[PDB]
């Protein structure tokens, strides 16, 4: 809890020194993290003296509240919250039969309070453009979870739901939450951000290749989380611009103008001006990784000399599985890049004549 | 209730919304019929009516103290800014007449756009009274607030300023 | 109404009751026939 | 139902209080009265005149109107 | 009985208003048959398919 | 015409703009499918249907209607439709189309 | 204290009006009920605490002509957005003559996120006015989250319309008219008989808005100064001498720059 | 039947035709629960 406050600042300092062109990178007010209400999680008759089929209605009533994160009269949410594992405490005096079942329906709660904490903490400007999209499309599945607990309440109101019916009813969403809660542990555990959490979403999608109940959820989280990364590549491939406000994109632009300017002592443009990053490569684009850099660097050395260089058409690119259509587009742009630079060089700055008169 | 208020917002104050010189249409009673807190909603709503009661007293005396042909022109204007605030109190009742469930809130939402034109057109009127901008320097105090910036009160004050320009285009047409 | 229309209307009921292809068999029997006799049969439900 | 405002005098009943008798005229009747008055007519039951001074009749009540607010609007028409 | 006629005309009018918000294409009289049928416990998924499939058959 | 089957003839004859007895060949289409299913197997709850039409309505660049629909959804609740609210409205959705083809 | 009692009260703590059995008893902390049910209210009652922040600041900031043309326009928008939260509340009221959708937790969720972001934008825009404020909103359109990026980027279009109003006049019209110090050029009045061109106009550096290149700010002055040098000295009053902003500045501004200078 | 599925998804080495088999044997375990639900409903069954 207190330990988290550090990580957010240390990461903030790194983007501030790296880019002084864009100033005052945004931060959220202190209360955003301090207020505990904003995040989801936070006369009692002796049950021992009750008849059996009344305890079931009570336990069902308390569980219906636990699913949305609000404490219950007979079942309490333990506040240790130590490490990352949430735990729950059921009343000691109940029927062993009912108690065991409750524990078997209780894992969807530990996979609801842990899931919600990740959607608050990894929504700050510091964690980077993709970690924001992953949690902003993970928050939509929470609303659809809240939807289901409301329909179950109406059935409970009409005396027409039981703990054996509830158990069967929640099985489909016990799985969706389990895939979202494990994926969130991993994106957090490796301190992954930028493209290190756009590879972890491509690989997990392969892990389940036959299931199709969980495969559609993951394939969706990558369509949603890759929307900002593809937008950066679309600018770099079709223009030399690398907006990249936080340091996340695979290509980086070193300010080697300070040393090499007026005299390009290092011929930096073709050496160390536009250079590559290794741990921020998406793992699906590793085959085209080298080409991307060349695709965009070539654009600059005509965009540097004032001759207008414009792609004839800029085509949009979307993550996809089983269909590498992005491959053909990267190539269609790459080929125009080299062609334009070579044509300008062999007519303007004509190299054939200069080479003879040397 | 929905006819007592939909006339209390208009000039007639009534028993619920008692009028006073220091503060206007301030209902002060604990009523079993209204919910304990609707008075808090009503207090916010009452602010709008108080200025509509006052704006008409001022147009009344005009159209030693302030006098002139301009106060007979800024005042005709204060009637036109207030015209979409009369038609929008007539419609509230028409909806209220048939639908028996709509509650005070619908009044709040429908009459929330009149909490930007009315508060910032009230300072122009107090300025013209506290300082006797009686001569042709009345046009200055409309064009000094007309650059504005809150867009609803920026075209409202424009409606008032142009009328002045029509009186100032008739005296200066007879001369030239 | 013509004869063909007043047979299907009857057929639907049976399906709500639970009598199924015993009601389609009726559709095919009529179809196989393709006179006003069915109209008399129609009047005589029971 | 909010079509019977001031019909309940429970608020009035909270302290001991005497109710005063009122005619209970309909809102539709009032419109016919003013239109005749705005034109030249004398001796209307509403807006009773006494000495060249037309004045709102002392006791008139409507289902959806409190006595004070009705007095305010009616006095206001009577001035014209 | 006049109040009954005003109740139905009021609610059928509200239902027509939603129909245009979803842009479904039903006119007032087809909406009239549709609600009158679905009023007796009709599995409305089955009816939706029937209406879609005839609208596609009437295309010739 | 109250009885269920009778209605379809009329429904069919106007949807299919033809004569009364002529349309029977296609009319036969509905008799089998509608008969196939009468007692719904999905439980009753209007809220889910209501929540669906706002979402559908919202991703189509038309978001005021996310509450205009809500205002209408209570207007009917004020009058009497005999608990068929879920069944009607649901129908009206599954026959949907954004005005733009997109 | 049955639940039917809580639902009636919570539906007003959304405006922010203290309820009957719910009140802001601790003046800084969120409202406290005076058991499972009690806890549920807290999440629902947060919207009121957030509501108190945005409303108490657009009530007052709106009446201050000092904040500046930019800032009063930010308030219009914080307020036009609050108006909409009230169309949702009016319905909920009528739905009272069940409506306990987990006590409306699912009803409140879409306004609750649209409340966290405007409430954040008010304290990040505190102190700042004029151009600096405009950048502090362009600061909040750098978040991948699609729904929050849809919301701010609309407010910014309104906030920066006055700014571009000073941009499309001080280039085309010839003169600049700001009472408070907001625009990114700083004229200094003095005789400037023959010294006019070199000293009367200078680029201020706190008020160039964040969505502009320093090259663009420098070029815009070169047009504002040229179209004004052309009237007050050369005495040739030829009237109407004819995504940052959807990539139209780099198209229009060079265009204005080119015509003007060629004539001078 | 449940002890085996409880351990294979706790094994990241069971493969990619083993994590398809182990996800096919829950659809046929869920329906057993569906039947149990009904057994419970008619309780108010010997």
Swiss-Prot record, chain A:
Q: Could you tell me in which tissues this protein is expressed?
A: Ubiquitously expressed.
Q: Tell me where it resides.
A: Cytoplasm, Cytoskeleton, Microtubule organizing center, Centrosome
Question: Family per UniProt?
Answer: Belongs to the TUBGCP family.
Q: Which disease is it linked to?
A: Cortical dysplasia, complex, with other brain malformations 15: An autosomal recessive disorder characterized by global developmental delay, variably impaired intellectual development, speech delay, facial dysmorphism, microcephaly, and varying degrees of cortical malformations including pachygyria, thin corpus callosum and subcortical band heterotopia. Most patients have generalized seizures.
Under the subunit heading, UniProt states: Component of the gamma-tubulin ring complex (gTuRC) consisting of TUBGCP2, TUBGCP3, TUBGCP4, TUBGCP5 and TUBGCP6 and gamma-tubulin TUBG1 or TUBG2. TUBGCP2, TUBGCP3, TUBGCP4, TUBGCP5 and TUBGCP6 assemble in a 5:5:2:1:1 stoichiometry; each is associated with a gamma-tubulin, thereby arranging 14 gamma-tubulins in a helical manner. Gamma-tubulin at the first position is blocked by TUBGCP3 at the last position, allowing 13 protafilaments to grow into a microtubule.
Q: What is this protein called?
A: Gamma-tubulin complex component 2
Q: Which gene encodes it?
A: TUBGCP2
Part of the whole protein covered: 150 to 516 of 902
UniProtKB/Swiss-Prot annotation, chain C:
Tell me the superkingdom of the source: Eukaryota
The coiled-coil regions, if any, are none
Disulfide connectivity for this sequence is none
Q: Where in the cell is it found?
A: Cytoplasm, Cytoskeleton, Microtubule organizing center, Centrosome
Disease with which this protein is associated in UniProt: Microcephaly and chorioretinopathy, autosomal recessive, 1: A syndrome characterized by microcephaly, cognitive impairment, underdeveloped retina and choroid, and epilepsy in some patients. The more anterior parts of the retina, near the periphery and pars plana, have a grayish hue and diminutive vasculature similar to retinopathy of prematurity. Visual impairment becomes evident during the first year of life.
| Function, as annotated | Component of the gamma-tubulin ring complex (gTuRC) which mediates microtubule nucleation. The gTuRC regulates the minus-end nucleation of alpha-beta tubulin heterodimers that grow into microtubule protafilaments, a critical step in centrosome duplication and spindle formation.
What quaternary structure, including any partners, is listed in this protein's UniProt entry? Component of the gamma-tubulin ring complex (gTuRC) consisting of TUBGCP2, TUBGCP3, TUBGCP4, TUBGCP5 and TUBGCP6 and gamma-tubulin TUBG1 or TUBG2. TUBGCP2, TUBGCP3, TUBGCP4, TUBGCP5 and TUBGCP6 assemble in a 5:5:2:1:1 stoichiometry; each is associated with a gamma-tubulin, thereby arranging 14 gamma-tubulins in a helical manner. Gamma-tubulin at the first position is blocked by TUBGCP3 at the last position, allowing 13 protafilaments to grow into a microtubule.
| Gene transcribed to yield this protein | TUBGCP6
UniProtKB/Swiss-Prot annotation, chain E:
Subcellular localization, as worded in the UniProt entry: Cytoplasm, Cytoskeleton, Microtubule organizing center, Centrosome; Cytoplasm, Cytoskeleton, Spindle
According to its UniProt entry, the function of this protein is described as: Required for the recruitment and the assembly of the gamma-tubulin ring complex (gTuRC) at the centrosome. The gTuRC regulates the minus-end nucleation of alpha-beta tubulin heterodimers that grow into microtubule protafilaments, a critical step in centrosome duplication and spindle formation.
Entry superkingdom: Eukaryota
Q: Which UniProt keywords are listed?
A: Acetylation, Cytoplasm, Cytoskeleton
GO cellular-component terms in the record? centrosome; cytosol; gamma-tubulin ring complex; interphase microtubule organizing center; spindle
Q: Which residues of the full protein are shown?
A: 14 to 73 of 82
> Main location per UniProt?
cytoplasm
What name has this protein been given in UniProt?
Mitotic-spindle organizing protein 1
* Assigned protein family: Belongs to the MOZART1 family.
Lyase as UniProt keyword: no
Name the lineage. Answer: Eukaryota, Metazoa, Chordata, Craniata, Vertebrata
Its subunit composition reads: Associates with the gamma-tubulin ring complex (gTuRC) consisting of TUBGCP2, TUBGCP3, TUBGCP4, TUBGCP5 and TUBGCP6 and gamma-tubulin TUBG1 or TUBG2; within the complex, interacts with TUBGCP3 and TUBGCP6 to form a luminal bridge with actin that stabilizes the initial structure during complex assembly. Interacts with TUBG1.
The GO biological-process annotations, alphabetized, read as:
gamma-tubulin complex localization; microtubule nucleation by interphase microtubule organizing center; mitotic spindle assembly
From Swiss-Prot, chain G:
Q: Which region is the signal sequence? A: none
Q: Which locations, inside or outside the cell, does it occupy?
A: Cytoplasm, Cytoskeleton, Microtubule organizing center, Centrosome
Tissue specificity field: Ubiquitously expressed.
- So which domain of life are we looking at? Eukaryota
Q: How does it assemble?
A: Component of the gamma-tubulin ring complex (gTuRC) consisting of TUBGCP2, TUBGCP3, TUBGCP4, TUBGCP5 and TUBGCP6 and gamma-tubulin TUBG1 or TUBG2. TUBGCP2, TUBGCP3, TUBGCP4, TUBGCP5 and TUBGCP6 assemble in a 5:5:2:1:1 stoichiometry; each is associated with a gamma-tubulin, thereby arranging 14 gamma-tubulins in a helical manner. Gamma-tubulin at the first position is blocked by TUBGCP3 at the last position, allowing 13 protafilaments to grow into a microtubule.
Give the UniProt family note. Answer: Belongs to the TUBGCP family.
Q: What the protein does?
A: Component of the gamma-tubulin ring complex (gTuRC) which mediates microtubule nucleation. The gTuRC regulates the minus-end nucleation of alpha-beta tubulin heterodimers that grow into microtubule protafilaments, a critical step in centrosome duplication and spindle formation.
Q: What is this protein called?
A: Gamma-tubulin complex component 3
> Upper taxonomic classification of the species?
Eukaryota, Metazoa, Chordata, Craniata, Vertebrata
Placed within the complete protein, the shown segment runs: 245 to 545 of 907
